[PDB]
Write a protein that binds this DNA or RNA. Structure first.
Ligand SMILES: N=C(NCCSC[C@H]1O[C@@H](n2cnc3c(NCCCc4ccccc4)ncnc32)[C@H](O)[C@@H]1O)NCC1CCCCC1
Ligand SMILES: [K+]
Ligand SMILES: [K+]
Ligand SMILES: [K+]
Length: 544
DNA sequence: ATGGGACTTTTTGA
DNA sequence: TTCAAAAAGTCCCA
């Protein structure tokens, strides 16, 4: 979890580069999760040069005996650097590092606190705040602790929110008037549904100076997280425009230049501005070309998928190894075919059509009692009885030990519907003809009856799989890792759709693609030509 | 050994 | 009663 030095230097320089040390020689710089002091040790170096370069001006303007170069080390540690961390071994190491910057005279007091930053009663605000807070999601966070966050941090922490939301809140709350904060956190709060309250909190309490979005790039080696750097202030400012630096190529190595600023100004990043006053509850962080593109589509389309469709998440068995068998597995001979459903994974979804299924789900909810079908329970499902019994609804009695945890409603699956993978590099919406069941890695919707005469499944997969809609969706989608976006209903169902003079031709092209994709000898190339023709029709329709 | 690519479970709050 | 969100993802190889 060590933050790379090139990022640490940038965040520290972002806050202190324009500090007027003559006007205020007592700046308070805080790291609320300082660890071993990746940031604070750099703050010390930057402060020391700042004081030494102006030592004679300070000696003249202020106590001429206090301001000597020999006194800078003590002054920094007594009045300027503040750290907090829950790990006492980390604080003990940082205290030793800060002491070793000078190399007892008299007992220098360092402002390091071993505590929970979210619980500490903070006695004063701070001029500058930097660091890299902990990230802990809803599954890994201790349940007794979550009761505390839901009580005391409800303005940013609810439901499936993350712990680092609370650090944004704490950092903002203890930032002095006119102060500057700069942190590196996961990027997901910029787009996620859970981050809505946090985005409202940031926008309405600080001026966001700058957002560095690394998208799917791997900033932390051997860590599966996607990062951003937020810089914000509480200055009295009227313009309130955000500098947004979005990475262009996710495969870039971060150390190509001596400094991060060189990387940002390079061709490896795009820069654009966003008006903070124009931010809705969603933050549309795109350049002017993309904003025009996005707005054209939004205004043109009179419907959304949510308007015309019923959406639902897939089956959640609660223990897949207990209920999912290969269709060639001999144990399926014990299971009556009335209990067996086709099962697909996200990899089975292509554009327009689903691979033939290779797995079967035992829809165990339809097993009436333990004595009629003893063989299935003893020889297939019962091999995982202990794990099945530990599921939440089994411990509370709502589920029998052999039942599916969230079996949903079979009738929603056993119908013509559209399916798409929950995480993908591109739009892949397929028409399911085979009553496929799936887990939560595949989402489904079917068309409401009253919209069937306006929209057909064949038309919908045509436009949703188009190049236009792939770009259109990815503008506001949640970037997860390198070449992975979330395709979840909370954004997929917000996709807006249109219907105009090109409807018949778009639908016809979609059927030709479906027909070719289902044939034995597939000449995939003609599909690409048809898709290009369809994309041109869609661009003609939307005026782009 | 590492960094990069394929692929994606069930726990959980509401 | 029962929905859907959540990557400090997870796992493997060359
Ligand atoms: N794998 C992880 N990676 C991220 C590392 S974060 C970097 C620094 O952040 C400090 N740090 C964290 N949480 C703090 C905090 N309050 C929140 C407390 C939340 C909590 C509640 C119950 C049980 C445990 C934690 N207050 C001040 N410092 C804090 C670390 O000690 C570290 O040196 N975190 C999970 C896990 C492991 C480290 C101990 C606890 C987190
Ligand atoms: K003086
Ligand atoms: K990443
Ligand atoms: K992992």
């Amino acid at each position: 979890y060590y933050t790379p030095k090139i990022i640490v230097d940038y965040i520290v320089k972002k806050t202190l580069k324009n500090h007027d040390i003559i006007k205020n020689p007592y700046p308070r710089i805080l790291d609320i999760s300082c660890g071993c002091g990746n940031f604070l040790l750099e703050v010390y170096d930057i402060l020391y040069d700042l004081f030494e370069e102006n030592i004679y001006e300070l000696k003249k303007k202020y106590d001429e005996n206090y301001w000597t170069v020999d006194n800078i080390h003590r002054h920094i540690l007594n009045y300027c650097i503040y750290g907090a961390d829950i790990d006492e071994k980390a604080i003990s190491i940082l205290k030793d590092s800060l002491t070793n910057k000078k190399v007892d005279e008299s007992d220098i007091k360092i402002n390091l606190f071993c505590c929970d930053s979210l619980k500490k009663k903070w006695r004063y605000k701070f001029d500058y705040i930097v660091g890299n807070p902990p990230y802990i999601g809803h599954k890994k966070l201790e349940k007794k602790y979550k009761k505390f966050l839901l009580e005391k941090y409800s303005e940013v922490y609810k439901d499936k929110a993350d712990l680092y939301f609370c650090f944004y809140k704490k950092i903002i709350d203890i930032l002095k008037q006119g102060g500057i904060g700069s942190v590196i956190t996961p990027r997901y709060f910029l787009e996620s549904l859970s981050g809505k309250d946090l985005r409202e909190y940031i926008k309405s309490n600080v001026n966001v100076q700058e957002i560095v979005d690394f998208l799917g790039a791997n900033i932390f080696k051997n860590i599966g997280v996607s990062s951003c750097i937020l810089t914000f202030d509480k200055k009295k400012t009227k313009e309130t425009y955000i500098d947004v630096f979005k990475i262009k190529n996710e495969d870039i190595c971060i150390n190509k230049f001596e400094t991060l600023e060189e990387l940002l100004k390079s061709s490896k990043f795009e820069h654009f501005n966003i008006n903070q006053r124009l931010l809705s509850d969603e933050w549309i962080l795109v350049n002017k070309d993309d904003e025009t593109f996005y707005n054209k589509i939004q205004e043109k389309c009179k419907y959304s998928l949510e308007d015309i469709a019923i959406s639902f998440q897939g089956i959640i068995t609660g223990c897949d190894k207990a209920f999912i068998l290969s269709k060639d597995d001999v144990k399926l001979n014990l299971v009556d075919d009335k209990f067996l459903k086709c099962w697909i994974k996200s990899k089975n979804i292509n554009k327009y059509i689903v691979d033939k299924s290779e797995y079967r789900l035992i829809y165990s909810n339809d097993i009436d009692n333990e004595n009629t079908n003893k063989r299935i329970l003893d020889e297939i499902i019962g091999l995982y009885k202990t794990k099945l019994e530990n599921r939440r609804e089994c411990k509370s009695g709502i589920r029998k030990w052999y039942e599916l945890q969230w079996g949903r409603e079979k009738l929603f699956f056993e119908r013509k519907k559209i399916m798409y993978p929950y995480k993908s590099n591109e739009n892949r919406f397929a028409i399911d003809y085979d009553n496929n069941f799936s887990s939560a890695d595949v989402y489904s919707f079917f068309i409401k009856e009253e919209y069937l005469d306006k929209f057909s499944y064949e038309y919908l997969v045509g436009i949703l799989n188009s190049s236009v809609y792939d770009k259109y969706f990815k503008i506001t989608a949640k970037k997860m890792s390198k070449n992975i976006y979330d395709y979840y209903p909370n954004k997929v169902m917000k996709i807006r759709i249109f219907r105009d003079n090109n409807y018949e031709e778009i639908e016809n092209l979609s059927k030709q693609i479906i027909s070719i994709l289902l044939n034995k000898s597939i000449d995939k190339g003609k599909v690409e030509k048809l898709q290009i023709k369809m994309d041109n029709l869609i661009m003609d329709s939307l005026g782009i």
